[PDB]
Amino acid sequence: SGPIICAGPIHSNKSANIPHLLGYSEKICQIDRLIHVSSWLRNHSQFQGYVGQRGGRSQVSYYPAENSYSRWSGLLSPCDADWLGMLVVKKAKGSDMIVPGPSYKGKVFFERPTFDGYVGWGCSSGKSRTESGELCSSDSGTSSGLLPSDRVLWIGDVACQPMTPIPEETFLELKSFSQSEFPDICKIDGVVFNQCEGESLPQPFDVAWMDVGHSHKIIMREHKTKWVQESSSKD
Amino acid sequence: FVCYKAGTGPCSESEEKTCKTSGSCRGDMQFCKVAGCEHGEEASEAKCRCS
Amino acid sequence: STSNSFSDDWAGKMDRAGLGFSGCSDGCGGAACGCFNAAPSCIFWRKWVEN
Amino acid sequence: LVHKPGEVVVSYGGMRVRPKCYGFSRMMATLEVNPPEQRTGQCTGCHLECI
Ligand SMILES: *[C@@H]1O[C@H](CO)[C@@H](O[C@@H]2O[C@H](CO)[C@@H](O)[C@H](O)[C@H]2NC(C)=O)[C@H](O)[C@H]1NC(C)=O
Numbered sequence: 294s295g296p297i298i299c300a301g302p303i304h305s306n307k308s309a310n311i312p313h314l315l316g317y318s319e320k321i322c323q324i325d326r327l328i329h330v331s332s333w334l335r336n337h338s339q340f341q342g343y344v345g346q347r348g349g350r351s352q353v354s355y356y357p358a359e360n361s362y363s364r365w366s367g368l369l370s371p372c373d374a375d376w377l378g379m380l381v382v383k384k385a386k387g388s389d390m391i392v393p394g395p396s397y398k399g400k401v402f403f404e405r406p407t408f409d410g411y412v413g414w415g416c417s418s419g420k421s422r423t424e425s426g427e428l429c430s431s432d433s434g435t436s437s438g439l440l441p442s443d444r445v446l447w448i449g450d451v452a453c454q455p456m457t458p459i460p461e462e463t464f465l466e467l468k469s470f471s472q473s474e475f476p477d478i479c480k481i482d483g484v485v486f487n488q489c490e491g492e493s494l495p496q497p498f499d500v501a502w503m504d505v506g507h508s509h510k511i512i513m514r515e516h517k518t519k520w521v522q523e524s525s526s527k528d
Numbered sequence: 529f530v531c532y533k534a535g536t537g538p539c540s541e542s543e544e545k546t547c548k549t550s551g552s553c554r555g556d557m558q559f560c561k562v563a564g565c566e567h568g569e570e571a572s573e574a575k576c577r578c579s
Numbered sequence: 580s581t582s583n584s585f586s587d588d589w590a591g592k593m594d595r596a597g598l599g600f601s602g603c604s605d606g607c608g609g610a611a612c613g614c615f616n617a618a619p620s621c622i623f624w625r626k627w628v629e630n
Numbered sequence: 631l632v633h634k635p636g637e638v639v640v641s642y643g644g645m646r647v648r649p650k651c652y653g654f655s656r657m658m659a660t661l662e663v664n665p666p667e668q669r670t671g672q673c674t675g676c677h678l679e680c681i
Pocket residue numbers: 312313332333336375376
């Protein structure tokens with residue numbers, strides 16, 4: 294839809310400090326103002342400046358261009374789940390492949406959920422990705438330090454939620470059933486999954502997945518979901 | 529298969545030979561399927577686009 | 580006449596799924612049925628075939 | 631209360647699991663390639679006799 298609590302600040306000066314917050318309300322408020330992305334850019338990407346002025350998290354573009362979860366403002370993105378302490382974000386490893394298809398021209402930061410976790414990819418100050426996104430070329434529009442919200446792309450539609458620990462036997466049975474239901478898949482990003490006595494060329498493959506906080510992911514084809522509210526106090 | 533760099537034009541022989549022979553190139557799904565491709569967006573000043 | 584029962588969440592947009600029929604049915608209401616209102620709930624379903 | 635359908639629970643093979651994140655995206659993977667290349671074309675040693 295639109296905003297959740299309020300709009301985005303003006304950010305008149307060059308770089309403003311980021312105070313620490315503890316309550317859920319102020320954290321949701323600063324997430325709605327696209328401050329978490331600025332904090333991530335100031336932690337590992339050393340990017341001076343803020344992005345998404347007066348745009349909020351509602352104007353964030355997506356690759357499929359038809360995101361039904363965008364109408365539900367209550368769902369939390371994986372970046373918000375990492376900001377809330379649910380999961381652990383992984384650094385940008387050069388050995389990881391990024392699924393092509395979107396045009397990275399004019400964009401400054403984009404995240405891609407990998408198979409063994411969640412990684413991010415951004416550029417430094419005054420630079421932006423090209424049409425292919427291989428390098429960070431110079432951009433005159435990125436010199437002001439304020440970038441609109443359309444320059445942030447989220448690869449794939451994924452939402453997170455609090456989970457419950459499960460024993461190892463159930464996880465092992467699920468992994469066995471998944472690897473038995475997909476005999477053609479052999480390796481996923483340099484991770485041994487099945488036994489094929491040989492590796493083939495990389496090829497895209499669309500399939501759903503879920504995480505239970507373990508090392509590798511678990512893909513599933515046939516699944517039945519159910520949405521329950523439960524009237525929890527955390528919401 | 530024809531290669532061309534965006535903004536510059538046709539590239540020289542070295543990059544196209546490394547794209548066709550080695551296999552660490554970057555192209556469409558057809559090139560990734562018939563010869564292989566590496567799209568890890570590594571550090572590179574330019575890349576000759578093949579299609 | 581709306582029969583497109585795909586709210587950007589079903590697995591119909593795949594290459595290995597195949598053919599199917601976008602159907603729907605009705606549900607019950609109450610705390611035991613999953614909602615907080617004594618009214619029928621919209622429950623969608625999708626079937627297909629595999630090999 | 632925030633506007634959302636709440637937490638989602640998925641069942642697979644009769645077992646109910648509460649995942650952390652739920653989404654559908656693409657991922658690079660490999661396929662199984664069988665290059666038989668005339669494993670057993672034609673080879674046999676026999677003989678004929680008359681009765
Ligand atoms: C990004 O950097 C900030 C700045 O250090 C990190 O904030 C710290 O978080 C730890 C964890 O609780 C606190 O003990 C420190 O006091 C914080 N420092 C501050 C607020 O200046 C932050 O954790 C880093 N990571 C993210 C995702 O923001």
